[PDB]
C-alpha cells in the first residue's frame, strides 16, 4: 500500500503536462525513497527522468516498492480535473489494477481511479564539458523562435544557439534571471528543436533550466522541482552523415 | 545531419 | 408593434451565447408579460425554457402577442455585433418579416434587421425529490472535468457526480459560493455530459445554478437571470436497458 | 551598405504582422530618405504603401539606394523571434543576397539572416470628397461586426457602414477617441469586408485610422506610425453590374 | 444505459 | 456588385 499526499498538487499537474505529449505509457517506480519515472519518448530519441523525493510529499508512505504502468495521457486527463490549488493524494495497493487520485479542494473532494497498464535503459555516468544555467522562459523562447528558422539547433558553448532553413538562418548568443556557464571544453552539438520544444513544456516547473553538454553524448535539459526533485530530459544528438 | 536514437547512446546491460 | 429596451444588453448577448449551439431555429413568444422562449434542442433530448420578464426591461411594450421564428445562430451573430456595454433595443411590428435590433453605445448606433422564419412541448408539474443549489462555475467545472472521464454522469444525491470510461472513473462529492441541498428523497440519475456541457454555456448569466432531480424524470438545470427571469434546461435522463 | 537601428522594434513587428497575410513577396525600397514599401496585395484588389522615414530610426544610413525583394511571411517569422521590447537593427550590403536582422534585448543578442528574393503601380493625385478620422479599434470592430452580416460594406458619408446578407442587414452610424469628418461631397462606396479586415491587422500601429473616399476611386485606409511615417491601404471598390 | 428523448417524458397537451 | 482590380483604377508610369 502506497499513499503520497501532495499539497501543491499543481506540481503533479505541471509534471504530467510536461510528459503527456512525449511518452504514451510509462512505468512509475514508487519506492520508500519516493516516486521515480524513467522513460524513452515514443520517438526513441530522448530519455525522461523524473524524480519526486518522498521528502517533497507532505505525507508519503510506501510499504513495498511498486511499478505502476500508466497511460500518461489518461493520467494527464485525470489531473486536469484537479483544481490548481487542490491537495492531491495518490493511493495504490499491491497488485493494483488502479491508481487512486484524490483531489481535495481547499466542500468538494474528487476521487479518481485510473486503470493501470502492465509494465529498461540505463543512464551512464557523464562529466559534462559544458553546463549552462539560464531562465527556463528564456530557453523556451529560444527553442520556439529558432523553430521558425529550421528543424535543428546548433548549440555552441557564452552559449550560441543557431538554426538554419530555406528562409535564412539565426544565431542566438547568451552570456552571463541569470545565465551561468561552466565550460571545461568548447562543445558544439546539433539537436532537433521539435524535441527541445517538447522539453520546454516543463518550463512551468522551475524558473531556471540547466543544459548539460559534451561532445557526442545526449544533451541533458534539467528542470528542478523545488524541494521534490527534478525532471530530466536527455536528447540524443543529430550527427553529421 | 541525422537524428540518432537514444538507445544508440545509452544501454541496458 | 413590440419594443423592448434593455440597458444591460450583455444579458441578451449571454442568453444567445447559451442557446445558439443547442437550438437551430426557435420561436420567441413575445407578450405583454415579457419574452418567452421554449424549444427542444436539435438532439430532442432536452427542453430549454427562457423567460425574460417585461419588468426586467427598462422599457417594454407589446400591443399584441407575437411569435417570432428566429434562427438563433444568425441572432447571436447579430448580437456579437453589440458592444458588451451597448443598450440593446428590440423592435418588431405585427406581421414582421424582420426583427429590429438597435445597439446604442454609451456616438455609435448600430441598426440590425434579422430575417424572421416561419414557426410544442408542455412542461408537466413536478415536485423534485432533490434540489441542489450550487455555484454555476463549480457545476460547469464538474461537467467539464467528468467529460474527460466518460460520456455519462451519475448524479447521486451531499451530491455525488460520477463518470466512468475506459481510462477509469471519477466521483465528485459536494456538500453544504455556497452549496445547498433540499432532499426529500435520495435520487440517482444518469445524464449525458455532452448536453450538460451545452447547458453550462449559460454560466455567465448567474453566479449559481440549481439542479432539480426526481426519479425517472428530466433534470432541471436552472440559471436565474437577476431581475429579468431565468434560463431553464430540462434534460431527459439515460435509462438502463 | 544600409543600416537602420530601431529602438521601438515593436513597430517593425507590428508592420509585418499587418502585411504578412496580404502580400506574399514585396520589394522594400531603401533610400536615404527612409524605407519605402509599395505592393499590391495577392488578390490584386488593394495597394499597400508603407513609409518609414529615416528620421524615425534612431540610427539610419543608406549609402546607395537598394531594392530588397522580401518574402513577407519569412520576414514575419524572423520578426516573431524579436522580443517585444528588443532593439532591432536592419543591415544590408550592396548586391545583398541577405538582409541582416539583429535583435538586442534590453544579455541576449539574436542575429538573423533572411534570404532575399529577386522581384510598378503608381498612386494618382486625388482630392478625397470625404475623409473620416476615427479610432482604429472602432473601425476594426465595425469591419469585424459587419462581416458577420455580409461580404460587402456600403460606406456612406455622419458616416454609415451598412452590410447585408442572407440573415439580414446592419447599419452602423458614427458621427462627430474622437470621430471627425471632412466632407466636401457625400459619397457612397461599396467594399469587400475581407480586405478591410486584412487592413485592420495594422490597428496596433495607431490608435486612430483615417478613411479617405471619393466617388468611383479606391478607398484609402491610413494608419500613421507615430514619428516614423504611415501604412496606407488603397482598396479598389466594388462596382454595380 | 441509453439516452431517452425529452418527448418520451414531456407531452403536447 | 462586383469587385474590381486595383490595377483597373491605378496605372503604371
UniProtKB/Swiss-Prot annotation, chains A, C, D:
Coiled-coil residues: none
Post-translational modification: Phosphorylated. Phosphorylation at Tyr-195 by EGFR stabilizes chromatin-associated PCNA.
Protein name listed in UniProt: Proliferating cell nuclear antigen
Function: Auxiliary protein of DNA polymerase delta and epsilon, is involved in the control of eukaryotic DNA replication by increasing the polymerase's processibility during elongation of the leading strand. Induces a robust stimulatory effect on the 3'-5' exonuclease and 3'-phosphodiesterase, but not apurinic-apyrimidinic (AP) endonuclease, APEX2 activities. Has to be loaded onto DNA in order to be able to stimulate APEX2.
Gene Ontology CC annotations of this record: centrosome; chromatin; chromosome, telomeric region; cyclin-dependent protein kinase holoenzyme complex; extracellular exosome; male germ cell nucleus; nuclear body; nuclear lamina
Documented effect of changing residue 123 to A: Complete loss of interaction with UHRF2
Record PTM N6-acetyllysine, positions in chain: 14, 77, 80, 232
Gene: PCNA
Disease per record: Ataxia-telangiectasia-like disorder 2: A neurodegenerative disorder due to defects in DNA excision repair. ATLD2 is characterized by developmental delay, ataxia, sensorineural hearing loss, short stature, cutaneous and ocular telangiectasia, and photosensitivity.
Gene3D superfamilies noted in UniProt: 3.70.10.10
Subunit structure: Homotrimer. Interacts with p300/EP300; the interaction occurs on chromatin in UV-irradiated damaged cells. Interacts with CREBBP (via transactivation domain and C-terminus); the interaction occurs on chromatin in UV-irradiated damaged cells. Directly interacts with POLD1, POLD3 and POLD4 subunits of the DNA polymerase delta complex, POLD3 being the major interacting partner; the interaction with POLD3 is inhibited by CDKN1A/p21(CIP1). Forms a complex with activator 1 heteropentamer in the presence of ATP. Interacts with EXO1, POLH, POLK, DNMT1, ERCC5, FEN1, CDC6 and POLDIP2. (Microbial infection) Interacts with herpes virus 8 protein LANA1.
Modified residues (Phosphotyrosine): 195
Family according to the record: Belongs to the PCNA family.
Keywords tagged on the record: Acetylation, Deafness, Disease variant, Disulfide bond, DNA damage, DNA repair, DNA replication, DNA-binding, Dwarfism, Host-virus interaction, Isopeptide bond, Methylation, Neurodegeneration, Nucleus, Phosphoprotein, Ubl conjugation
The species this protein was found in: Homo sapiens (Human)
KW Acetylation (keyword) present: yes
InterPro entries given in the database record: DNA_clamp_sf (IPR046938), Pr_cel_nuc_antig (IPR000730), Pr_cel_nuc_antig_C (IPR022649), Pr_cel_nuc_antig_CS (IPR022659), Pr_cel_nuc_antig_N (IPR022648)
Consequence of changing residue 212 to I: In ATLD2; a hypomorphic mutation affecting DNA repair in response to UV; results in significantly decreased interaction with FEN1, LIG1 and ERCC5
Annotated disulfide bonds: 130-157
PANTHER family according to UniProt: PROLIFERATING CELL NUCLEAR ANTIGEN (PTHR11352:SF0)
One GO-annotated biological process of the protein: positive regulation of DNA-directed DNA polymerase activity
Additional information: Antibodies against PCNA are present in sera from patients with systemic lupus erythematosus.
Pfam families in the cross-refs: PCNA_C (PF02747), PCNA_N (PF00705)
Binding region for DNA: 61-80
Crosslink site: Glycyl lysine isopeptide (Lys-Gly) (interchain with G-Cter in SUMO2): 238
Compartment(s) where it occurs, according to its Swiss-Prot or TrEMBL record: Nucleus
Annotated GO MF terms: chromatin binding; damaged DNA binding; dinucleotide insertion or deletion binding; DNA polymerase binding; DNA polymerase processivity factor activity; enzyme binding; histone acetyltransferase binding; identical protein binding
Amino acid at each position: 500500500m502506497f499513499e503520497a499526499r501532495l499539497v501543491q498538487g499543481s506540481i503533479l499537474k505541471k509534471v504530467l503536462e510536461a510528459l503527456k505529449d512525449l511518452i504514451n505509457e510509462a512505468c512509475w517506480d514508487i519506492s520508500s525513497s519516493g516516486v521515480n519515472l524513467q522513460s524513452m519518448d515514443s520517438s526513441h530519441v530522448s530519455l525522461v527522468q523524473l524524480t519526486l523525493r518522498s521528502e517533497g510529499f507532505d505525507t508519503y508512505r510506501c510499504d513495498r516498492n511498486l511499478a505502476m504502468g500508466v497511460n500518461l495521457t489518461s493520467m494527464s486527463k485525470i489531473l486536469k480535473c484537479a483544481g490548481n490549488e487542490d491537495i492531491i493524494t495518490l493511493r495504490a495497493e499491491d497488485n493494483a489494477d488502479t491508481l487512486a487520485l484524490v483531489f481535495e479542494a481547499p466542500e468538494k473532494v474528487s476521487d479518481y481511479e485510473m486503470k493501470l497498464m502492465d509494465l529498461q535503459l540505463g543512464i551512464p555516468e557523464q562529466e559534462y564539458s559544458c553546463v549552462v544555467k539560464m531562465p527556463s522562459g528564456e530557453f523556451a523562447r529560444i527553442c520556439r523562435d529558432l523553430s521558425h528558422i529550421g528543424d535543428a539547433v546548433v548549440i555552441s558553448c557564452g552559449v550560441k544557439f543557431s538554426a538554419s532553413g530555406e528562409l535564412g538562418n539565426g544565431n542566438i548568443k547568451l552570456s552571463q534571471e541569470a545565465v551561468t556557464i561552466e565550460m571545461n571544453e568548447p562543445v558544439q552539438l546539433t539537436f532537433a528543436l521539435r524535441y527541445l520544444n517538447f522539453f520546454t513544456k516543463a518550463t512551468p516547473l522551475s524558473s531556471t533550466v540547466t543544459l548539460s553538454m559534451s561532445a557526442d553524448v545526449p544533451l541533458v535539459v534539467e528542470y528542478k522541482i523545488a524541494d521534490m526533485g527534478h525532471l530530466k530530459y536527455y536528447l540524443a544528438p543529430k550527427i553529421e552523415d | 545531419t541525422r537524428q540518432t536514437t537514444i538507445t544508440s547512446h545509452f544501454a541496458k546491460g
